[PDB]
Structures are given as structure tokens and as C-alpha cells.
Amino acid sequence: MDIDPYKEFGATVELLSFLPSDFFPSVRDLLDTASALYREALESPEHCSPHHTALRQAILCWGELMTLATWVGVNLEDPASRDLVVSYVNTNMGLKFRQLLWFHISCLTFGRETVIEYLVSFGVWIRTPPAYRPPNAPILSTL
Amino acid sequence: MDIDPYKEFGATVELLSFLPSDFFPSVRDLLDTASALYREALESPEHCSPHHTALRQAILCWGELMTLATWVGVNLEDPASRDLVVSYVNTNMGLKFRQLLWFHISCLTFGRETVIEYLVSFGVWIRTPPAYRPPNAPILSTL
Amino acid sequence: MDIDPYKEFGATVELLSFLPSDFFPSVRDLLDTASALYREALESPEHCSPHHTALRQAILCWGELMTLATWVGVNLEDPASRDLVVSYVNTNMGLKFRQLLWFHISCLTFGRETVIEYLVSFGVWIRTPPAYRPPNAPILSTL
Amino acid sequence: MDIDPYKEFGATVELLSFLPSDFFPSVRDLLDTASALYREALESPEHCSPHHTALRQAILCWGELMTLATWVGVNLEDPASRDLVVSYVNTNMGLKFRQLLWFHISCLTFGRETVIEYLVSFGVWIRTPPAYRPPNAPILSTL
Ligand SMILES: COCCOCCOCCOc1ccc(C(C)(C)CC(C)(C)C)cc1
Ligand SMILES: COCCOCCOCCOc1ccc(C(C)(C)CC(C)(C)C)cc1
Ligand SMILES: COCCOCCOCCOc1ccc(C(C)(C)CC(C)(C)C)cc1
Ligand SMILES: COCCOCCOCCOc1ccc(C(C)(C)CC(C)(C)C)cc1
């Protein structure tokens, strides 16, 4: 079916493509962050939050994709296709994964309205010209 | 992270290992059941329930895995690799997909208590040797 | 008929003639901004605002002009005339279009009074010669 | 963004398609009418009505297209290109322009409900076979 993984939260793919693809941190970095900050609540037997649920399912899915790609590469004999699997994964699905993880982690941490206003402001900013925008890229802080 | 996609909901992979592997319906049947009973909810912008929050993500994961295997079978001129990848997807991950779909659809339709009782009772019925096994296995029913 | 597209909103062309070309984001950027911030209200059957109405009509104009430029590229076998028409369209019409899109988005975003005070101040700043005006221009920003 | 210029007023492209392309008056005639009837308003500094706003924007776009056509006629020596461009502009873009002009002038003048009932009645007419199609095609009146 046609589902938007964010509209149950108050966002949309059209709104997260409003940021450059070179903005979203790497998958490994986001997973490390997620461990460090919410391992005890993702591994928890509680409906702690919809973000927790969705993040769990996403992590399991990335793990299964990784498993599959490693298996294909290990079985295949020639590199041309022993690589193309993991390569295409990190190309097309890595972006979706890290957009979604960024969303969920950032929300759980800072706030949903904050993350949304940040998306909007950062798009407006990265689209405005430098002479007439503030010079420092926007960023999220708990400090 | 070792996440159990069920302990959040009050279960485990073990409790679901009582059911054999050939017990679980086809992914087509289960996707049809979902599109029938819970579509307006899985497309809604609401946290209708953690079951929905999980089912949306799992369906997106399955779609992306399908796209992967298809792009593979297409761009890979080795039909052996095509077949192996796309059918191993089924072999290994479809069983998990349909376990999770079964669990969620059944805890939505009938309930958590009813489903866990069903799991216990079916485990009894199946661990029981045949000679003493009644032919009327437990079936989940609203009627 | 001597129509001023801002006289209805309390502004004028003479008040936006000071804003240079390097001030206005690209057409693509402004369109993405609108699509991300106001799509569910520009595609809506409500009279959400004069700015919404005007944005709708201007986007329709621009879409038809892009259709024209495509038809040109396809039906004009004179590369010179073809490229000259396309460049005229883009440069001139997109400059006017960026001007108007900016006015409307900025108003909807900040306020009519804020946008007009900002225009007055930017005019003061841009009339001042460089030897007596600060180097850092005024700035309209949510941040 | 896919936008319907009539959906905020209470109609739909699929509804004004009931009327043939050779039904709408000349752009000349429609502009004469709009001038004579609402010039003091389309030149006004007031959101007199959404129809007024939309008409302002449309007439501005038509004026820019006229300026384009003159620029072509003077610059481009290639007669085939010049004429093809002017003809495309007038024919197609003016078909759309006079659809819009007609809708807005007619609404402002007679009424939205009147215009929509007229659309459905004209559909009835044009659908009725010529053996039973009265020659008195429906027409909008204030009497
Ligand atoms: C080969 O099957 C063995 C059955 O035992 C399952 C053991 O693993 C636990 C399965 O749990 C899941 C369920 C779903 C999933 C996701 C959400 C990632 C969906 C999937 C598998 C379709 C990608 C991941 C793990
Ligand atoms: C190259 O990526 C472009 C961005 O795509 C935009 C998103 O398109 C709609 C679908 O979005 C998602 C988001 C996440 C996912 C899941 C949860 C399955 C995770 C993933 C991407 C790791 C497979 C699937 C689809
Ligand atoms: C070839 O003509 C097709 C007839 O129109 C079918 C309906 O198309 C819907 C779009 O309608 C309009 C109407 C007006 C316009 C504007 C106001 C932008 C004016 C125009 C046509 C001069 C560009 C754009 C689209
Ligand atoms: C070439 O641009 C120079 C700057 O403009 C100077 C005059 O400013 C007045 C702007 O007038 C318009 C006219 C039309 C428009 C719309 C939005 C209808 C778009 C267009 C140009 C595609 C017709 C916008 C502004």
C-alpha cells in the first residue's frame, strides 16, 4: 500500500527531502547514537513511544538487509556483483534509513515541533543566498 | 542491539516457535487480510496502535526488500544469481515477515490474551504425539 | 489595465525594485519551499488566503510557461531562436516569479508588517553607497 | 504541486470540460468586459474577492506573454519560429486564459451557483443528440 512512515508523527517525505542528502549523518553514527542514548528503552518490554517502536522495526530491517547483502556477496564469485548488492543498498536504502533514524532520534531527544521547525528553517536557509542569510548553519542543541 | 520485535507487545520469538514454520499463511494472504481489515488505519495519520505503527514499518521493509531483489534479478545477467537472491529473500525473511504479520493481525482482530492462550494451546496440541492428538486443532475464531 | 500585483497586499513594485537579483532564491528553491510548507493548503478547496490564491495562479502560469519552453525545444529546429526564447523566459519571467513567490511566502511566514518594514530597511541600506553602509545586510529569518 | 484553479471556487477541470473549446469568447472580448465591469476594482488596493485576485494574476501573466510575443516578433528573424511561437501562445495559452476569464467574470457577474448549474445544464444540452437538442443553447442572464 501507499504509506508515509512519518505522517503518523506529523511530517512527510516531501518535507524531509526539503533538506540535502549530504546533511544526514551516516548509518553507523546514527546507530551508535541510538544505542548510547536509548538501548535500555529499545530493548525494553514497554510501548515506550511510537518512535521507539518504529525505530526498533527500522533497526531490524536494516539488520536483515545487511545480512542479505553479505550473504549474496559471500556466495557470488565475481566482484562486479559481489559488491553491487551492498553498494546499491548503501546508495538507495541508506538514505531512507538515515533520514528516518535522524527524524526519530532527533524527535525523541529535542522535540517534534522543534525537529519540524528545524527542517523548515534549514531548508529555507540552505536555499537562501549567503549575503542575506545568517552565516552559521542551523543546528540542534540540548545545551 | 538484540531487539525482540514482540516483547514490546508481550511475547517472544520463543513463545512463537511453538508454531511450526509451515503453519504461517502466505505473505499474499496476510497482506490481503491487512488491506481488507486495517487499511484505512494503516494509511491514516494517527497512532491508532503500536500494532499499526509496527505493521506500517514492516510493510515498507518488505516492499524495499522486494525492490532490492527485483533490481537484482534485472541488472544481474546471471539468472542463477537472480533466482537465488530473490528466492532466498522468501526462504529466510518471508517466514519472519509472516510471523510478524500473523502476530499483529491476530492481536488486533482477537486480542493479546486470546492469542497467547492460542499459542500455548497449539503448543500443547503439537507437542502431543499424534496417536493422542485430537484432529480438531485450535483455530482462532470470533464465531 | 495597469495592475500592481502587490497593491492588493499593501506593497508596490517601487518598494521591491530595490531588492536585487542576487537576493531572490532560485525558482526551484522557492517552488520546493512552497510545496513543503503550503502544499496541503494550495491543493485545498478552501480560500485559505489571498496569498494562497495568488500563489496558485502564479504557479499555474509558470507551469504553462515551462510547457511552452518544452514545446519550443521540441518544435523549433533553430537552436538559436530556441535557446534565446528559453533564456528570455527563464531569466525575465523567473525573476518576476521569484520576486512574487518571495513576497508571498515571506508574508505568510513572517507578517505583512514585518515584510514591509524589512523592505523599507533594505531600501535604506541599498541606497546607501558601500562607503557608508554596513557590509552585512538586513536579514529576514525565523532563526 | 498539481493545482486546480477552480477547486477553491467550487468547480473542477472535469466540470468545465463540459464546454467545448469553441464555446469561450475571444480574449479581446473577455478583457473588454472585465475592464468595463471591474476595472476600478482590479486596479484597487483591496482583496475585493478571490476572483479579483485570480484575475489580476492571470492578466499579469497574459501581459507578460504579450510582451514575450512582441519581443519575439522584433528579435527573432526566423519567421517560422516567430510565427510558431506566437501561434502556440495565442491558441493554447489563450484557450486556457479564456476558460479562466470566462469562469471568473461569469461567477462575479451572475453567481457561483448560477455558473455551476449552467455548466451542468450546458452539459445536458451538448450531450442531447441533435434530433432533440433545442437550438436555444443555454445562456447566462440577469433578467
Ligand atoms: C528463518 O526464519 C526463522 C524464524 O525465526 C525468526 C527469528 O528471527 C526473529 C524474527 O523477527 C523479525 C520479524 C520481522 C523483522 C522485520 C521487521 C525486519 C521484517 C522483515 C524480516 C520482513 C524485513 C525482523 C525480525
Ligand atoms: C534513496 O532514497 C530516497 C528517499 O526516499 C524517500 C522515502 O520514500 C518513501 C518510503 O520511505 C521509506 C522509509 C523507510 C523505509 C524502511 C523503514 C523500510 C527502512 C529502510 C529504508 C532501511 C529499508 C522504507 C521506506
Ligand atoms: C490547451 O488548452 C487546454 C484547455 O485547458 C484545460 C484545462 O487546463 C487546466 C489549466 O487551466 C489553466 C487556466 C489558466 C492558467 C493561467 C492563469 C496560468 C493562464 C495562462 C493559460 C495564460 C498561462 C493556467 C491553467
Ligand atoms: C524582469 O524582472 C525584473 C523585475 O521585475 C520588475 C517589475 O516588477 C513587477 C513584477 O511584476 C510581475 C508580473 C507577473 C508576475 C507573475 C507572478 C504573474 C509571474 C510571471 C512573470 C511568470 C508572469 C510577477 C510579477
Query: At residue D129, what are phi and psi to the nearest 5 degrees?
Result: -60, 155
**Closest Cα to residue D50, out of D91, D108, D90?**
D108
CA distance to B127, C58, C96, C131, D55, per residue, from D60 (Å): 80, 9, 11, 39, 8
The span from the CA of C136 to the CA of C130, in Å, is 11
What's the gap in Å between B93 CA and the centre of ligand 1?
6
Angle (nearest 5°) at CA A19 between A14 and A23:
140
**Closest Cα to residue D87, out of D114, D74, D107, D69?**
D69
Decide: helix, strand or coil at residue D107. helix
The span from the CA of D56 to the CA of C51, in Å, is 12
Q: Are D51 and D34 in contact (CB under 8 A)?
A: no
CA distance to C28, C102, C112, C126, D79, per residue, from C16 (Å): 21, 11, 14, 12, 37
**Closest Cα to residue C141, out of D2, A123, D94?**
A123
Residues shown for chain C: 143
The span from the CA of B58 to the CA of B63, in Å, is 9
The H-assigned helical ranges of chain D are 13-16, 27-42, 50-75, 79-88, 94-110, 112-127
CA distance to C98, C129, D101, per residue, from D57 (Å): 14, 35, 11
The span from the CA of B59 to the CA of C34, in Å, is 30
Place of cell 527542517: A119
| CB atoms inside a 10 Å sphere around CB C40 | 10
| Cα A58 from chain centroid (whole Å) | 9
The span from the CA of D17 to the CA of D123, in Å, is 9
CA distance to A84, C5, D23, per residue, from D99 (Å): 53, 21, 9
Q: Are D51 and D108 in contact (CB under 8 A)?
A: yes
Q: How was it solved?
A: cryo-EM
| CB atoms inside a 10 Å sphere around CB A140 | 12
CA distance to A40, C13, D31, per residue, from D54 (Å): 57, 18, 14
Q: What is the dihedral of CA A10, A16, A18, A22, to 10 degrees?
A: 160
Chain A residue numbers with beta carbons less than 8 Å from the beta carbon of C143 are 121, 125, 134, 138
Q: What is the resolution of this structure in A?
A: 3.2
The span from the CA of C122 to the CA of C131, in Å, is 16
**Closest Cα to residue D54, out of D70, D38, D67?**
D38
| Nearest Cβ partner for C36 among A18, A133, A138 | A18
The span from the CA of C4 to the CA of D56, in Å, is 8
Instruction: Answer yes or no: do A124 and C142 touch at CB < 8 A.
Output: yes
DSSP string, C12-78: -STTTSSS-STTSPPHHHHHHHHHHHHHHHHSSSS---HHHHHHHHHHHHHHHHHHHHHHHHHH---
B56-89 in b/e form (b: 16+ CB < 10 A) is bbbbbbbebbeebbeebbeebeeeebbebbbebb
DSSP class of residue D55?
H
Chain A residue numbers with beta carbons less than 8 Å from the beta carbon of B43 are 1-3
CA distance to A1, A7, B23, B59, B105, per residue, from B35 (Å): 8, 18, 21, 11, 11
What's the gap in Å between A124 CA and the centre of ligand 1?
40
The span from the CA of D103 to the CA of D119, in Å, is 10
Residue D86: which region, alpha, beta or left (left: phi > 0; alpha: psi -120 to 50)? alpha
**Closest Cα to residue A99, out of A40, A13, A32, A10?**
A13
The span from the CA of B45 to the CA of B56, in Å, is 11
Confirm or reject: Cβ of B73 under 6 Å from ligand 1: no
Residues shown for chain D: 143
Q: Are A75 and B84 in contact (CB under 8 A)?
A: yes
The span from the CA of C110 to the CA of C106, in Å, is 6
Residue type, B99: Q
Angle (nearest 5°) at CA C25 between A139 and C54:
110
Please tell me which residue of chain C has the smallest CA distance to A140: C143
- Listed by start position, the domains of chain C span 1-143
The span from the CA of A41 to the CA of D135, in Å, is 77
Query: Taking the alpha carbons of A126, A132, A135, A139 in that order, is the dihedral positive or negative?
Result: negative
Q: What is the dihedral of CA B113, B119, B125, B129, to 10 degrees?
A: -150
The span from the CA of A47 to the CA of A45, in Å, is 7
The span from the CA of A28 to the CA of A26, in Å, is 5
Chain B residue numbers with beta carbons less than 8 Å from the beta carbon of A46 are 8
For chain A, give the secondary structure using H, E and C: CCCCCCCCCCCCHHHHCCCCCCCCCCHHHHHHHHHHHHHHHHCCCCCCCHHHHHHHHHHHHHHHHHHHHHHHHHHCCCHHHHHHHHHHHHHHHHHHHHHHHHHHHHHHHHCHHHHHHHHHHHHHHHHCCHHHCCCCCCCCCCC
Task: Name the CA radius of gyration of chain D, rounded.
Answer: 17
Place of cell 509451515: B22
Place of cell 543546528: A139
The span from the CA of C122 to the CA of D134, in Å, is 64
The span from the CA of C125 to the CA of C116, in Å, is 14
Q: Are A51 and A102 in contact (CB under 8 A)?
A: no
**Closest Cα to residue B37, out of B133, B91, B107, B127?**
B107
Decide: helix, strand or coil at residue B47. coil
Q: Are D67 and C28 in contact (CB under 8 A)?
A: no
The span from the CA of A52 to the CA of A39, in Å, is 10
**Closest atom of ligand 1 relative to the A63 alpha carbon:** 18
The span from the CA of B8 to the CA of B31, in Å, is 22
Residue type, A25: P
CA distance to A85, A97, A101, D137, per residue, from A93 (Å): 11, 6, 12, 59
Residue type, B32: D
Q: Which helix (H) or strand (E) holds C112?
A: helix C112-127
Helix axes D79-88, C50-75, angle to 10 degrees: 150
| CB atoms inside a 10 Å sphere around CB C2 | 7
CA distance to A123, A139, D14, D49, D69, per residue, from A142 (Å): 21, 10, 52, 47, 57
Grid cell, residue B140, equals 482462532
The span from the CA of D107 to the CA of D117, in Å, is 11
| Nearest Cβ partner for B45 among A7, A65, A75 | A7
Q: Are D30 and D101 in contact (CB under 8 A)?
A: yes
Q: Which residue's C-alpha comes closest to atom 8 of ligand 4? A: C13
The set of long-range contacts for D121-125, using a CB threshold of 8 Å and a minimum separation of 24, is D122/D18, D122/D19, D123/D18
Instruction: Answer yes or no: do A123 and C36 touch at CB < 8 A.
Output: yes
The span from the CA of B137 to the CA of B50, in Å, is 30
**Closest Cα to residue C88, out of D27, D2, D81, D91?**
D81
| CB atoms inside a 10 Å sphere around CB C98 | 20
Between the two ends of chain D, the Cα-to-Cα distance in Å is: 41
Instruction: Answer yes or no: do A121 and C137 touch at CB < 8 A.
Output: no
CA distance to B27, B112, D134, D143, per residue, from B11 (Å): 21, 9, 74, 76
Place of cell 519581443: D71
| CB atoms inside a 10 Å sphere around CB D44 | 15
| Nearest Cβ partner for A134 among C30, C39, C141 | C141
DSSP class of residue B25?
P
Please tell me which residue of chain A has the smallest CA distance to C22: A129
The span from the CA of A44 to the CA of A47, in Å, is 8
Query: Taking the alpha carbons of D40, D41, D42, D44 in that order, is the dihedral positive or negative?
Result: positive
Q: Are A10 and A112 in contact (CB under 8 A)?
A: yes
**Closest Cα to residue C11, out of C89, C93, C134, C118?**
C118
| Cα C135 from chain centroid (whole Å) | 24
Grid cell, residue B32, equals 490481503
The span from the CA of C95 to the CA of C23, in Å, is 10
**Closest Cα to residue A82, out of B91, B88, B72?**
B72
**Closest Cα to residue D5, out of C100, C44, C56?**
C56
